[PDB]
C-alpha cells in the first residue's frame, strides 16, 4: 500500500478496534523514512498504546492470580508460565516501538514538538519494561529527562504534550523509582504552572490540556489518600 492508504486503513482499524492491524499500517508508514505528521504521529501512538495496553492488562490479572495461588502449587505454576508468556509478547511490543523510535522517529524529528513526543514515548515503553523486569529504569529516566528539558524550554506550561509528559514522568517517579515526593512535586508544579496560564490555552488543545490537568490533580489527591 501507499502512505495515504495505510493511514486511511489505520483509521478504519481503530474504529473496528483492531489494534494490531492499525499498528502494522502505522509501523509500515513509519518505515518509509519520511518524518510523520501530527495525525500520523497520534495514530502510531494510539495504535501501540492499545496493543501494549492489552498485554499490560493481561499481565496484571495473571500476576495477581499468581500471587493469590500461593500455597496451591499446580495453580501457581500454570499462572507463572502464562505470565511469562504474556511478558514475552509485551517485551517484543515494547522493543518494536523502541526500535522504531531509535531508528526512524527520534533522528528525523525535525521539530521540538516531535522530539519531545518521541522521547516521552521512549521512556513510556521503558517504563512498561520496568513494570515487568531492573537497571533499565535509568533509560526510562534519561529519555524522560531529555524530553522534560526540551519541553520546559520550548513549550507553554499548558501544552498537552508537556502536561502529558509531566503526568507520565511523575508516575515513573512514583511507581518505577518508588519516590512519591519526586512524583507529587513534579505534578503539583506541572499543574500549578498550567493553572496560572490558562489564557495560553488554544481551542485546538484546551480539551486535551484541561483533561490532563485533571489527571494530574487526581494522582496528587490519591497520593495523599
Amino acid at each position: 500500500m501507499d502512505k495515504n492508504e495505510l493511514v486511511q486503513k489505520a483509521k478504519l482499524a481503530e474504529q473496528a478496534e483492531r489494534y494490531d492491524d492499525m499498528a502494522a499500517c502505522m509501523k509500515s508508514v513509519t518505515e518509509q523514512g519520511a518524518e510523520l505528521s501530527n495525525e500520523e504521529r497520534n495514530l502510531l501512538s494510539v495504535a501501540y498504546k492499545n496493543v501494549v495496553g492489552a498485554r499490560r492488562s493481561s499481565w496484571r490479572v495473571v500476576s495477581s492470580i499468581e500471587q493469590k495461588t500461593e500455597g496451591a502449587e499446580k495453580k501457581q505454576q500454570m499462572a507463572r508460565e502464562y505470565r511469562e508468556k504474556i511478558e514475552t509478547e509485551l517485551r517484543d511490543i515494547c522493543n518494536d516501538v523502541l526500535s522504531l523510535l531509535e531508528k526512524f522517529l527520534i533522528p528525523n524529528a525535525s521539530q521540538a514538538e516531535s522530539k519531545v513526543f518521541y522521547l516521552k514515548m521512549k521512556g513510556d515503553y521503558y517504563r512498561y519494561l520496568a513494570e515487568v523486569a531492573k537497571g533499565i529504569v535509568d533509560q526510562s529516566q534519561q529519555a524522560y529527562q531529555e524530553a522534560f528539558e526540551i519541553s520546559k524550554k520550548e513549550m507553554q506550561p499548558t501544552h498537552p504534550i508537556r502536561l502529558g509528559l509531566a503526568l507520565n514522568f511523575s508516575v515513573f517517579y512514583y511507581e518505577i523509582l518508588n519516590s512519591p515526593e519526586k512524583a507529587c512535586s513534579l505534578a503539583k508544579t506541572a499543574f500549578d504552572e498550567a493553572i496560572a496560564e490558562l489564557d495560553t490555552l488554544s481551542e485546538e488543545s484546551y480539551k486535551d490540556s484541561t483533561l490532563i490537568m485533571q489527571l494530574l490533580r487526581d494522582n496528587l489527591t490519591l497520593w495523599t489518600s
Binding site: 503526568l167 507520565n168 489527571l215 490519591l222
Partner: peptide, 8 residues
C-alpha cells in the same frame, strides 16, 4: 489507580 496518558 494512578492515571497515565497510557490507560483507559
Amino acid at each position: 489507580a494512578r492515571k497515565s496518558t497510557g490507560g483507559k
